[PDB]
Design a protein around this ligand. Sequence first.
Ligand SMILES: [Zn+2]
Length: 321
Amino acid sequence: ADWEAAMLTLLMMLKVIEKADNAAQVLTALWFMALAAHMAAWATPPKLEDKSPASPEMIDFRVGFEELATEIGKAIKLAALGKVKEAQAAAEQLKTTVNAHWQKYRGGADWEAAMLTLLMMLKVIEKADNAAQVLTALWFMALAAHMAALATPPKLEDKSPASPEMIDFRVGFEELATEIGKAIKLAALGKVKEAQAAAEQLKTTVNAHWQKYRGADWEAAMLTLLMMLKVIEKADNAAQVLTALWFMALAAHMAALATPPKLEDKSPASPEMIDFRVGFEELATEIGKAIKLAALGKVKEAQAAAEQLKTTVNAHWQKYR
Ligand SMILES: [Zn+2]
């Protein structure tokens, strides 16, 4: 992805946390920070593009970002437990790490933290009104399940990774991640009530999985891109454009390994399916470009980039819907 726009996203989201009031705004903005840190972890700053990947200067950048991702997970769990003030206090120390890391290269969550996020997002879905609030909260659920996918509950840290008890935890989470993808497609198709009905059954799976360890498909995400593009065109500030663009980068990330329905019987090395892979890379690349224009504050030029983004989204979705 991009480095500095995610670093600009981290800075802007910290400004949203300090002026937030409830714990949901803090938890969502912290996950957007964990999202930006997840995409930018693979990136490379501009002044280090001509340094060896095994170089100590570039390898110091790797552990430097691990410290930043780890600090965000600690602030998320504080925001997940309802400690809205102590999490904002953790956002103060977070800004020190973000500023120290950004200035050095700017040219010139744990298990129950996500499980508490899943529970809180379900409370936002039940009190939602439109399909966008349900669709966004469901992606935050898919986000929380994605970052905590390789996580480990506290009561299972002393169990073998190949142990059937820990193995049952892996497939148990796959059922949870798969259930969320089904509810997202219902929310993507506009079925706001049936998706909330799927959120009822989702809470049963979340409660059953959390208590045992407390101590999206292709066209689903493609409909979210068109959904977010409709939110970008009717947005006002640069924050709404940035959040919706990250939701587009989020949907493209979860649906990257996805397969359209008309290509499920095509070889993975087939040029027709291969053309689908590079076609999605062009889409993820254009999204990253629009995020940087939105991160620099250019709310109009980013929306102008969202116009050209809709041309790529419409041409790609039509070819495989
Ligand atoms: Zn990932």
